[PDB]
Amino acid sequence: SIAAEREAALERPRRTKRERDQLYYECYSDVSVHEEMIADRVRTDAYRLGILRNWAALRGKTVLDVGAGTGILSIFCAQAGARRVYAVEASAIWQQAREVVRFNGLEDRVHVLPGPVETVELPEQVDAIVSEWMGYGLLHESMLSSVLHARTKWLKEGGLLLPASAELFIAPISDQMLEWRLGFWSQVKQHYGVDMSCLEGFATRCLMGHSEIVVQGLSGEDVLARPQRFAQLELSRAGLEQELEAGVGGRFRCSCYGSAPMHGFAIWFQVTFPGGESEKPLVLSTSPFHPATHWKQALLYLNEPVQVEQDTDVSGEITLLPSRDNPRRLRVLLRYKVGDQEEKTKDFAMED
Amino acid sequence: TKRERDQLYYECYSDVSVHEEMIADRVRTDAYRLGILRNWAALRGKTVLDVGAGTGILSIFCAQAGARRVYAVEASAIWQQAREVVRFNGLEDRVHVLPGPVETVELPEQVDAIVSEWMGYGLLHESMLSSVLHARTKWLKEGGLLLPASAELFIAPISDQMLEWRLGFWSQVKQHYGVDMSCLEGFATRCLMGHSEIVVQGLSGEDVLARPQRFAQLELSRAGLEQELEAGVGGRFRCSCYGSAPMHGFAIWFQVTFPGGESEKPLVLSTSPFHPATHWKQALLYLNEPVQVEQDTDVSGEITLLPSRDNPRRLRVLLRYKVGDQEEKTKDFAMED
Numbered sequence: 001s002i003a004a005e006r007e008a009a010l011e012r013p014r015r016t017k018r019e020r021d022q023l024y025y026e027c028y029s030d031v032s033v034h035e036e037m038i039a040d041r042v043r044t045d046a047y048r049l050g051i052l053r054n055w056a057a058l059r060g061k062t063v064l065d066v067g068a069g070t071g072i073l074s075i076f077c078a079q080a081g082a083r084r085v086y087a088v089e090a091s092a093i094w095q096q097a098r099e100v101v102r103f104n105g106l107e108d109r110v111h112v113l114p115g116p117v118e119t120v121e122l123p124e125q126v127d128a129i130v131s132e133w134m135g136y137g138l139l140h141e142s143m144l145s146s147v148l149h150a151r152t153k154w155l156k157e158g159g160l161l162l163p164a165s166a167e168l169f170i171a172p173i174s175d176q177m178l179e180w181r182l183g184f185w186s187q188v189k190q191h192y193g194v195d196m197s198c199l200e201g202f203a204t205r206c207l208m209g210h211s212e213i214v215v216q217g218l219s220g221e222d223v224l225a226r227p228q229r230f231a232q233l234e235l236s237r238a239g240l241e242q243e244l245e246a247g248v249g250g251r252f253r254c255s256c257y258g259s260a261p262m263h264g265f266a267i268w269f270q271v272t273f274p275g276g277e278s279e280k281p282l283v284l285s286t287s288p289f290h291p292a293t294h295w296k297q298a299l300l301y302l303n304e305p306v307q308v309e310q311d312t313d314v315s316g317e318i319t320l321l322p323s324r325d326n327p328r329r330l331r332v333l334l335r336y337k338v339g340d341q342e343e344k345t346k347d348f349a350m351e352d
Numbered sequence: 353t354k355r356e357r358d359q360l361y362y363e364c365y366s367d368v369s370v371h372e373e374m375i376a377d378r379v380r381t382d383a384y385r386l387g388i389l390r391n392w393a394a395l396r397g398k399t400v401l402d403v404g405a406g407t408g409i410l411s412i413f414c415a416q417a418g419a420r421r422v423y424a425v426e427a428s429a430i431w432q433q434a435r436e437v438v439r440f441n442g443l444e445d446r447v448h449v450l451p452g453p454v455e456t457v458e459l460p461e462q463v464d465a466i467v468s469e470w471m472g473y474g475l476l477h478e479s480m481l482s483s484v485l486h487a488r489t490k491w492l493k494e495g496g497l498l499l500p501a502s503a504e505l506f507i508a509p510i511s512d513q514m515l516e517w518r519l520g521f522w523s524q525v526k527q528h529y530g531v532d533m534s535c536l537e538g539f540a541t542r543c544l545m546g547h548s549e550i551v552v553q554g555l556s557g558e559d560v561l562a563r564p565q566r567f568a569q570l571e572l573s574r575a576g577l578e579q580e581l582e583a584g585v586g587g588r589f590r591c592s593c594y595g596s597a598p599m600h601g602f603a604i605w606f607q608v609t610f611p612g613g614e615s616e617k618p619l620v621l622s623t624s625p626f627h628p629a630t631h632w633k634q635a636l637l638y639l640n641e642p643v644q645v646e647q648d649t650d651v652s653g654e655i656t657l658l659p660s661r662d663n664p665r666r667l668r669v670l671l672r673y674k675v676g677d678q679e680e681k682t683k684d685f686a687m688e689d
């Protein structure tokens with residue numbers, strides 16, 4: 001009755017969250033998002049090889065695949081020699097995953113289970129967990145909590161986690177697409193005979209003055225200083241679920257290579273698969289120096305461009321967290337200082 | 353309500369992106385450029401109304417063509433940028449920028465010519481043509497010039513090779529990953545073809561399966577044209593296919609025509625897949641799933657373009673069609689978000 005009233009107090013927020021989660025899972029009910037993920041060969045091959053590389057530890061064992069999607073990774077586990085895979089999926093796509101499993105003659109080895117991993121009922125604890133949970137800037141979507149919840153509740157003592165860790169990186173960058181778009185108004189006179197160079201200011205406010213994280217792929221030569229690691233996440237680390245709510249990040253400092261128009265920062269990530277005593281640990285990287293992936297990079301624009309020079313000092317602080325309104329939307333708090341300019345603040349939220 | 357439909361519409365035109373896109377659209381901007389300049393004899397010393405002047409570029413084309421006065425009317429916040437561009441080009445006493453919707457603007461005089469780039473996806477998306485016709489009736493002098501003067505709509509059955517590759521993707525998964533996912537073709541089809549949305553995507557001429565059929569001609573000088581827009585524009589079509597293909601649906605596109613001047617050759621701005629690409633691309637009307645056609649497969653039906661009930665600016669397409677001897681089918685579309 002006091003107990004009853006306490007439940008009645010949490011009923012409203014618990015329902016809002018259920019409704020929110022349901023909108024998020026729907027983001028994965030359509031073909032395109034899976035098409036994109038499986039066409040991403042770097043992503044998909046890193047998982048396949050990461051799994052394969054651990055066939056010795058997986059032979060005859062059991063696996064939980066958190067967010068099975070179309071079932072692909074679960075099937076990788078089955079092919080690696082796993083006795084049993086529980087393919088858990090909260091989005092309507094679990095139906096396609098079930099179809100793929102049956103079509104591949106694997107319905108005895110892979111069990112597709114609908115609904116959230118947080119409330120799924122497995123018949124036993126598992127020897128390994130596999131999950132592709134990473135969002136833009138690693139933490140967009142906030143799926144990691146789900147994976148950690150599954151670990152604490154269902155992974156056997158000393159069990160395997162694929163992947164096992166993640167690292168976050170930041171570098172000052174120059175966006176060539178952005179530069180072209182800002183410069184476009186100065187080109188109008190030469191194409192059509194009307195001087196529109198006075199709109200550069202306006203173009204800059206629209207395209208750089210907003211507070212959204214932008215997903216764009218850059219290449220090596222857009223990076224204006226040595227990339228700095230700013231966070232390391234060891235997935236097995238006790239109560240890391242709390243660290244997430246409070247923010248993950250760190251401070252950074254670096255020195256620019258040379259003359260360049262600086263537009264802001266790129267952040268990206270990598271995840272590491274533990275290796276068997278075969279081949280060693282396999283890194284899946286989303287770096288602009290490395291083969292492109294569907295995550296690209298997450299771009300954080302300064303309000304306007306800043307010219308940097310060789311040995312220009314760039315430092316600051318970055319923290320990744322949930323947005324106030326949408327816990328599944330990535331927020332980035334950026335503190336930064338370029339050259340002799342004063343320290344500045346920008347508070348970004350993931351592009352819809 | 354209605355107030356909030358317009359905030360969202362004009363907010364998009366308040367921002368740089370759509371203007372960069374229209375202006376980087378070379379086929380579009382150079383058609384207006386040449387179209388305007390070749391009507392110098394109609395424009396020199398005359399007065400012009402630019403309906404929806406945006407950044408003011410076409411108004412400036414008009415002034416460069418000799419107009420003594422241009423009224424550049426713009427309902428979004430971008431009117432500030434247009435006034436700046438006008439000042440910067442020393443054109444403030446030739447071009448006057450006026451904020452607000454053309455429906456309620458007051459000009460100091462009736463005009464000799466109207467210019468406007470009012471066309472949306474599938475021609476009528478955004479429903480801006482009302483505004484131009486409203487301005488013609490209220491402000492254009494008897495016998496005045498309209499740039500462009502007319503519009504035409506076209507339809508053709510299509511096989512969209514890019515879509516075909518997206519449907520066939522699932523059959524290629526085994527080759528590279530060792531998992532057979534070819535059983536997901538059905539699901540891919542329902543996702544990419546089974547919805548009711550008009551898709552703005554660019555096609556190749558090689559995607560066109562039959563001779564394109566004109567299904568509407570819009571003569572802008574015609575009183576009464578206003579009232580038809582509400583009934584719907586369109587009518588029947590029929591054509592016969594070139595060869596074997598999986599037909600995915602139909603593409604529609606449009607052209608607009610600027611009268612020739614003294615030089616006397618009309619300039620046509622086309623959005624056909626047989627012509628250089630524009631930012632309008634083509635508007636795609638996918639059937640629920642592919643249908644196999646052969647050479648001389650007859651394709652017929654009826655198409656209506658009209659505004660949605662709940663949102664007057666959102667294009668709606670009502671399609672009725674018959675492929676070969678297959679039974680007649682029906683499908684309703686609304687413009688993509």
Ligand SMILES: Nc1ncnc2c1ncn2[C@@H]1O[C@H](CSCC[C@H](N)C(=O)O)[C@@H](O)[C@H]1O
Pocket residue numbers: 025028037038066067068069070071072073088089090091093115116117118132133143146
């Ligand atoms: N709490 C939760 N429980 C179960 N599934 C979840 C979840 N949160 C997210 N998901 C699912 O996890 C998937 C992540 S992406 C798809 C990964 C898929 N295994 C692949 O590699 O292709 C989505 O399908 C999403 O619906």
Ligand SMILES: Nc1ncnc2c1ncn2[C@@H]1O[C@H](CSCC[C@H](N)C(=O)O)[C@@H](O)[C@H]1O
Pocket residue numbers: 362365374375403404405406407408409410425426427428430452453454455469470480483
């Ligand atoms: N009823 C109305 N009154 C005034 N402007 C309008 C309008 N409906 C749409 N517009 C404006 O008309 C423009 C259409 S597109 C911009 C065209 C610009 N003349 C160019 O060719 O680059 C937009 O700027 C839009 O805000």
Ligand SMILES: CN(CCN)Cc1cn[nH]c1-c1ccc(F)cc1
Pocket residue numbers: 027033036037132133134135136141294295
């Ligand atoms: C980011 N990847 C990998 C998720 N593990 C999913 C994806 C691929 N394309 N688009 C998405 C996506 C993007 C944003 C979402 F909220 C959900 C999915």
Ligand SMILES: CN(CCN)Cc1cn[nH]c1-c1ccc(F)cc1
Pocket residue numbers: 364370371373374469470471472473478631
């Ligand atoms: C469709 N064109 C030309 C309109 N005269 C404007 C444009 C360019 N990019 N995107 C748009 C656009 C698209 C949809 C809208 F509701 C408004 C503008």
